[PDB]
Amino acid sequence: RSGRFGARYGRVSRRRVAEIESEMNEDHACPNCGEDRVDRQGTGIWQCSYCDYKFTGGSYKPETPGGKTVRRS
Amino acid sequence: TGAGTPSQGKKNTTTHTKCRRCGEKSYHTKKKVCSSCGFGKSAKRRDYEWQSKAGE
Amino acid sequence: GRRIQGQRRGRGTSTFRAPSHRYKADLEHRKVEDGDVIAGTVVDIEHDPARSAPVAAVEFEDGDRRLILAPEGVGVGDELQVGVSAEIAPGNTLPLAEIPEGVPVCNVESSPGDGGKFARASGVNAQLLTHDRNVAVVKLPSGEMKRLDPQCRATIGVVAGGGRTDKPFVKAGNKHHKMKARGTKWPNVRGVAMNAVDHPFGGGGRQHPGKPKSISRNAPPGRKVGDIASKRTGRGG
RNA sequence: GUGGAAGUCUGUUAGAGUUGGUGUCCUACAAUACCCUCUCGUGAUCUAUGUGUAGGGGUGAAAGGCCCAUCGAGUCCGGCA
RNA sequence: GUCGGGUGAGAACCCCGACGGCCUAAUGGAUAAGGGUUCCUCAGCACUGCUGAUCAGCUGAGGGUUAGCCGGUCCUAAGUCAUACCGCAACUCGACUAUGACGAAAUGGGAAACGGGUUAAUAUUCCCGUGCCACUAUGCAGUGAAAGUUGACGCCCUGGGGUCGAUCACGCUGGGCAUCGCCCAGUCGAACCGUCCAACUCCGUGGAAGCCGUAAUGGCAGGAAGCGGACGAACGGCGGCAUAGGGAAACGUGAUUCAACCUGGGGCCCAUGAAAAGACGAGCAUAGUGUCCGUACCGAGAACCGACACAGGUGUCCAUGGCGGCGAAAGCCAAGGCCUGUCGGGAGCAACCAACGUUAGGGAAUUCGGCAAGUUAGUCCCGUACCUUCGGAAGAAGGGAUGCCUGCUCCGGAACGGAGCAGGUCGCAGUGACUCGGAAGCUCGGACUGUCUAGUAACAACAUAGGUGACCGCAAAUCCGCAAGGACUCGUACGGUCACUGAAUCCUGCCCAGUGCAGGUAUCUGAACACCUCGUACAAGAGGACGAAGGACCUGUCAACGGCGGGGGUCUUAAGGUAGCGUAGUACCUUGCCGCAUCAGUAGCGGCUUGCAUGAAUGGAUUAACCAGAGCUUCACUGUCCCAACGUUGGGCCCGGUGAACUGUACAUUCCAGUGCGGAGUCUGGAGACACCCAGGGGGAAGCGAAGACCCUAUGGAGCUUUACUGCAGGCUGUCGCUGAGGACUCUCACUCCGGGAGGAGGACACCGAUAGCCGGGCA
RNA sequence: CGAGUGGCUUGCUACCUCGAUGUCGGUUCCCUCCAUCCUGCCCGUGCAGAAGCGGGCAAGGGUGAGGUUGUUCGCCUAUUA
RNA sequence: ACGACCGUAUAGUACGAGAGGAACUACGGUUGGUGGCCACUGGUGUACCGGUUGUUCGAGAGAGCACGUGCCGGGUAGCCA
């Protein structure tokens, strides 16, 4: 996590980096199939190693709160 | 690094060269303009009244 | 004195220019004759240097390959539509008139056919509120109620890359890398830290502006610095 | 255990720099040099060439720093005896 | 460097040999820029050369650079120019938009050449051998031909293939050494043509419900392993090339580790890592053509820049030569280069200075200050505190070990890889040289890495992430231009402009009176044009009515400028200092008082604190980590000191040669007093004084160097400031023109904007020209 | 209260010097003065002695080491004739 | 070119109720200063002898280099305190 930051930057800065990146690297359920094989490819870019579905999502999460709103309405 | 002698050693760039139009080594090969006769800048020949005393 | 930095900017010299020769494309909506008989398929997702957000390359029926301002949730293979009769789904573009009220949209045109001006940044979106035969009311990301020509085109959904702002840069070097992809001079030297000759706030034994910071709207360039025509300052009251 | 992150550590690797000696030199080897010590050395890094910004104007992580040994307004000639 | 010798009229430094040395990312090899003949030969020494010179980068005279396949040439990059269009009083000026061209010689892209031989000097260019590319022609073949592929790409970790090199084993050829049997060198051979293919991808078979696989991640009923197959790599292997070439000869064979080169797997991005020409796609024979430009040499302690044959500066590649060791480290040594970081001779060679070695006992007493020097040191084992943001602190601290020889064990395929064991044994000392941290505590500052005064400042200053406020919906805010136009912007509020504070943590009180900004405003004030009155046969002019912004007035606002006192148990002028911190890098008084520590402490630390004159983003407090930042203490150590000594190298001194500069009104062997514009070698009185020369450390010549920088003066200069004087840009606002029809309104036709277009939006407004009022250190 | 000497403190003046006479403290090295701190020799005492206290002659010699502070000065410590 | 001090004998005496406590003189030493000298002790001693690390000369022997001794031990003359 923020362990690469050593004793620098302070709690908050490297607390959020840890969480954000912790959620960022979790296995994500592919919208195409259903497997938890989605990985980030770059800023806002995600892909499933299983079915190869490459799509857009949040910067650090494949789905954002606002993104999930569109579906509804 | 001093602005004097040590900095003079870095000077190996060619800028002013013999001019096709006037013959003076004033044709800036990077600007493609002669600082002496104006070649590359103007069809007319570079001239100024301040090149001599005002009443002469 | 000497011209302040804000004045050097205007001359548009390299130091202040954006690395345009490195930019990809201006994600403007496609121009359709009518009918809406224009559809294409997402062929790839790319990074947009100018916006730090993803963009989707779309191949249209008539053979036109162009990058598009992608909303969140668009993936390869997906099929998008652009026209009056386009289906009401994420990633599709059509005039506000056809868009059902209460639907989040992005890359909204200011004047019908301009290509899109509003809500283009990461994870943002305008909210189409009121419909009509004369004016479509949209609520822009800043919270402002905007009256637009119902003929103004827009893309359904919110812009991809949301949350980009939630993570701190942490170090100067990261800011550095981002700044190198924009038309900006960075880092920032405070005005109070300069000599009097260089800024209205320069000079003085200790650092401090020797004047009130709220400057008038009518101030000439070179003097308009600090808090421009502020309606108020601070956090109190 | 594996893995190998880092404006991460040591390092006269290349390369960059310069804390102290208030050493040597001070009609110098040199109009900014020499020696030892010292600091940086995967990055906001260093470096070559090309290219752009011009004088009340540039350029400046700001020292009134830098813009060809000169800058709190370059240089040249002219105004000018 | 030295001894011999060669040449020459002449030899320390020109050449030969021997002996002795120096250089190893360079003092060697190839080159870019730049220089321009400095290159080679012959003949010379007046000039140039830190002395000499027969020498030379010098002088005289000749000579030398050979290309289809190495660059250029071709392509396009940031970007530049030209033409057209537009602006400008105008242009050699100026932004945009079209078109065209220009823009890369080591080091972007790119059709094709290798090996050897030859010259005094060129050489993938000439010559020999072999090969290749493009175009064109002829011929055979071919109807395919443009889709796609390539050119073509970031950073970090890593597997696999694999050549050179290096090393190990054994053989062959030659050399060296001479108690041994060791040691050294060589053992060769290209482009190209042909062939082989690992990885990746995919297909067939198969049928895993837990197996397959990796260094690691991972893979699978959407079909794992296994089996077969398609496509498919090297500057690599293999065969030809080659009774080519090269070698005196032999003219090897295997292996390990493997730069180059080839091919994969993984990870990172608020960062996304060129383009175009060209090539492939798309056969073969034979013939012809392949022009133009560059080509020498230096590439640096003498060929470049720095006035110089300057200790400076100056790009690339040789990053795999041996021992060493972690190593592209040190040290030593090859290949190769050099004795030109170019004056020599002499004196146990004194004083004195530079750089350095060794110092008994004491051990920081030295000093502003351990400045300088020293101490420690590599690797392994044991062990490691406070504090902490849980990362770190940490190599904390402290303790022990370390060589050689003999025989072995373990890990691994193995290394000429690594980890251990047993016995033997030497020294004062086993990281034996070299390389190689001294350690600990308290306080102040800035959080951190980073930046800076080229040439006296590296810091606490600037930056920074983080915090905050301000402006703006894009026909925007901010900014450049006289204009035509332009940056921001292939950007759109999760944006970007303008400012302040400066990581995290706990927090950030009161004040809107003044000033600033903004909003509002009945009434008041408020310009010009038009309008009305008076005046004028007209006009000047006087007055009136109307009244925009602005001001008066009201309100909002301090993470806006800033403020938070005196007095009494309110007063100025709004409030009257809250949390904290406190004698501070802020406290004059002041060495404040108490304590700690010391023999003794204007220091330092802790506490107190009425604070001359602390205090909350003019941020307060606090703080782990970090630091060539400031201060203090301790352990260790030492020539810093007591107190100096001896030694080493280069100078100094004497000799040959070469050979400056600073400075100079004159006189001048001075000393003690006095005098004098009061700070005299020169005046007065005395005293002393034979001339000249060598070495010395510098008392005096108010020594030399610079028309004092300090201070004042000048109706001197410049940079900077502002509610100084006066103006000028700029913004806001009214009015007139553009400008049309029917104190409030509709319309469309100018004009503006959007749209490829139709058309849509807006609209007599806005933009623009003119003028008037307000603001106006942005500027003069 | 009165009279003086010095030129160590400070003040005053503006005589010399602005085409420059480089600051304080320290250090090192040399000479000097006496208004004597010690040492020699004396006089007095509220001088038994020992020792103090005061005075006279006298400048031959000596007057040292350390803690804070740049400090001079001074405060402090152990030695000392 | 010598200044000064401590100690012993004088003497637990003179003096004094006691407490305390001298001197002349003769001696021994210390300190500061001064001039000189090296038998003694100490330092140095890149004369010299030895040990030993890395590397090169094939090993051995014997040597070079590692800065004017690679490092370490001893140390004659001489110079010194």
Ligand SMILES: [Cl-]
């Ligand atoms: Cl940003």
Ligand SMILES: [Cl-]
């Ligand atoms: Cl070439």
Ligand SMILES: [Cl-]
């Ligand atoms: Cl792999």
Ligand SMILES: [K+]
């Ligand atoms: K003066």
Ligand SMILES: [Mg+2]
């Ligand atoms: Mg776009």
Ligand SMILES: [Mg+2]
């Ligand atoms: Mg940039």
Ligand SMILES: [Mg+2]
């Ligand atoms: Mg800043």
Ligand SMILES: [Mg+2]
């Ligand atoms: Mg400043």
Ligand SMILES: [Mg+2]
């Ligand atoms: Mg200013």
Ligand SMILES: [Mg+2]
């Ligand atoms: Mg500040």
Ligand SMILES: [Mg+2]
């Ligand atoms: Mg450059």
Ligand SMILES: [Mg+2]
């Ligand atoms: Mg040659």
Ligand SMILES: [Mg+2]
């Ligand atoms: Mg030389």
Ligand SMILES: [Mg+2]
């Ligand atoms: Mg000693």
Ligand SMILES: [Mg+2]
């Ligand atoms: Mg002292």
Ligand SMILES: [Mg+2]
């Ligand atoms: Mg030191």
